[PDB]
Amino acid sequence: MKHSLPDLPYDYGALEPHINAQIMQLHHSKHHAAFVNNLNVTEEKYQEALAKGDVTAQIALQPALKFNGGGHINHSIFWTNLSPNGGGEPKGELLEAIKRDFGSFDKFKEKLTAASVGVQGSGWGWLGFNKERGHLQIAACPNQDPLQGTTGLIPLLGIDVWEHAYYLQYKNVRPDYLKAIWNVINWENVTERYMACKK
Amino acid sequence: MKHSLPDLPYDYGALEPHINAQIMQLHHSKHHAAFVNNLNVTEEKYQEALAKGDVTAQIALQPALKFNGGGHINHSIFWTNLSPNGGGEPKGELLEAIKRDFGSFDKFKEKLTAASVGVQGSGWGWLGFNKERGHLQIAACPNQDPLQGTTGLIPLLGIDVWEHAYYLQYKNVRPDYLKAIWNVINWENVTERYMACKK
Ligand SMILES: [Mn+2]
Ligand SMILES: [Mn+2]
């Protein structure tokens, strides 16, 4: 296909003061850009290996494909989950699903925050939808491992806990970054992803 | 180019009494046959996904590709590492490299045996060649993870320690299986693989 870096739906500084412009610029234009460039290179190498039936090469390329491929997937979703018009609480069917599956919105916040802060090293915190069980589910993924590709869950809301996502502003205080990000969550986008899972 | 199950270079009972015919027949005609068939099915699914640029599908298929792909690679080498003409000790440059890197042939035997018996669960014990360092190296791989694809080492001699490789004959006494396999090692094939790395 030849993947490309998607344009951001807002200005790099639109999420201030919760996430500063310098992080957004570096996070989008440098880290994400690298994943897309390396993903395209990795996909081209795998196509050659498949043509020659080189199983050894296919397996050797799996870490680069998952790492760069997942990085493209994860960050592409991440940008749509944020908005300068975000924050507050969700409404409608998504709010009802959260109460049913987690009890209340506040308890959901605590569990997703704990899952994200509890990540040892680099990874992601995710609110996902389990098609088999038909309910919401919280999961954490290491490094750039994508939720759906590795767990089967449909991603609804992702929290990047890579140090590059918060270290320029919040230093080592990961909880402060988690507390601040709730102010810019685009619940409209999360709702659209949730409704897409239902019939 | 479509992978196929290789024919065994000897009769199923040629390795008796060290490895009985029932294990060889089941190991080759049942287990290996499934890996090659499932490998081909997996490659077709990945080829379609790669054409559409579906990164999620590519990542979801990685476990099946590594498991079935590695199984095809590992067992295809395994059969060539055994021979009714095997046993004894290696000669020539291979014997010299073993003494240099391991001290003596007996010490190499002890180290590869320990690596194979020490595998927790299913996996493989391997004598490999390190292209970067230009010396021999022993490594263990879990499940069907192939040596070269995951470590870069060139496989010279592999020991299958999956329970299906010995449980019918040696029950839970894995050390007895390792003791018997040394009598049927095809050092001629190991030498040809080793010499192919040097130039
Ligand atoms: Mn990131
Ligand atoms: Mn086996």
Which of B2, B73, B39 is CA-nearest to residue A52? B2
User: How far, in Å, CA of B145 to CA of B53, rounded?
Assistant: 26
Instruction: State the structure-solving technique.
Output: neutron
Out of B56, B57, B70, the one facing A59 most closely (by C-beta) is: B70
User: How far, in Å, CA of B84 to CA of A125, rounded?
Assistant: 56
User: How far, in Å, CA of B54 to CA of B46, rounded?
Assistant: 9
Token pair recorded at residue A130: 């389990």
Q: Flag if B1 and A53 touch (Cβ within 8 Å).
A: yes
Q: How far is CA A16 from CA A11, A25, B148, B191, in A?
A: 10, 12, 48, 65
Please give the distance, rounded to the nearest whole angstrom, from the Cα atom of residue A30 to the centre of ligand 1: 10
Q: Which residue do the tokens 């192939």 mark?
A: B146
A127 DSSP β-pair partners: A138, A157
Ordered DSSP codes for B163-186: GGGTHHHHTT-HHHHHHHHGGGB-
Q: Are B166 and B57 in contact (CB under 8 A)?
A: no
B120: number of Cβ within 10 Å: 7
User: How far, in Å, CA of A129 to CA of A185, rounded?
Assistant: 18
Q: Is B88 exposed, middle or buried (0-12, 13-18, 19+ CB in 10 A)?
A: exposed
Which of A161, A129, A156, A166 is CA-nearest to residue A143? A161
Q: Is A28 annotated as a binding residue?
A: no
Interface membership of A31 toward B (CB under 8 Å): no
User: How far, in Å, CA of B127 to CA of B56, rounded?
Assistant: 35
A125 DSSP β-pair partners: A140, A159
Interface membership of A55 toward B (CB under 8 Å): yes
Out of A62, A69, A72, the one facing B66 most closely (by C-beta) is: A62
User: How far, in Å, CA of A46 to CA of A66, rounded?
Assistant: 12
Q: How far is CA B123 from CA A43, B49, B74, B174, in A?
A: 29, 29, 10, 13
Q: Are strands B154-160 and A154-160 parallel, antiparallel or unpaired?
A: unpaired
B125 DSSP β-pair partners: B140, B159
Which residues, including other chains, have CB under 8 Å from residue A58's CB and lie 6 or more apart? A46, A49, A50, B46, B65, B69, B149
Please give the distance, rounded to the nearest whole angstrom, from the Cα atom of residue A121 to the centre of ligand 1: 13
Domains recognised in chain A with CATH numbers: 21-80 (1.10.287.990), 92-197 (3.55.40.20)
Q: Flag if A52 and B148 touch (Cβ within 8 Å).
A: no
Q: Are B112 and B159 in contact (CB under 8 A)?
A: yes
Q: Flag if B3 and A55 touch (Cβ within 8 Å).
A: yes
Q: Are A152 and A126 in contact (CB under 8 A)?
A: no
Q: How far is CA A135 from CA A91, A107, A109, A176, B174, in A?
A: 17, 16, 17, 29, 45
Crossing angle for the helix pair B62-81 and A62-80, nearest 10 degrees? Answer: 170
Which residues, including other chains, have CB under 8 Å from residue B100's CB and lie 6 or more apart? B135
- Runs of H (alpha helix) within chain B: 21-26, 33-52, 55-60, 62-81, 92-102, 105-117, 147-151, 167-170, 174-181, 187-197
A39: number of Cβ within 10 Å: 24
CA within 13 Å, CB half, A47:
14
Handedness of CA A161, A164, A168, A173 (dihedral sign): positive
Token pair recorded at residue A148: 């759906």
Q: Flag if B59 and A149 touch (Cβ within 8 Å).
A: yes
Q: What is the DSSP-derived secondary structure letter of residue A31? A: I
Q: Is A31 annotated as a binding residue?
A: no
Judged by DSSP in three states, A125 sits in strand
Q: Which residue of A has its CA nearest to B45?
A: A50
Interface membership of B46 toward A (CB under 8 Å): yes
Q: What is the DSSP-derived secondary structure letter of residue A121? A: S
Strands ordered across the beta sheet of A123-130? A135-142, A123-130, A154-160
Q: Are B95 and B188 in contact (CB under 8 A)?
A: no
Which of B95, B79, B90, B74 is CA-nearest to residue B19? B79
Q: Are A143 and B59 in contact (CB under 8 A)?
A: no
Q: Which residue of B has its CA nearest to A64?
A: B59
Q: What number of helices (H) and strands (E) belong to chain A?
A: 10, 3
User: How far, in Å, CA of A106 to CA of A140, rounded?
Assistant: 19
Q: Is B108 exposed, middle or buried (0-12, 13-18, 19+ CB in 10 A)?
A: buried
User: How far, in Å, CA of B196 to CA of B61, rounded?
Assistant: 32
CA within 13 Å, CB half, B163:
7
Please give the distance, rounded to the nearest whole angstrom, from the Cα atom of residue A134 to the centre of ligand 1: 29
> This structure's resolution (angstroms)?
2.3
Token pair recorded at residue A9: 């739906």
Crossing angle for the helix pair B105-117 and B174-181, nearest 10 degrees? Answer: 140
Nearest ligand atom owner, CA of A70: 1
B77: number of Cβ within 10 Å: 21
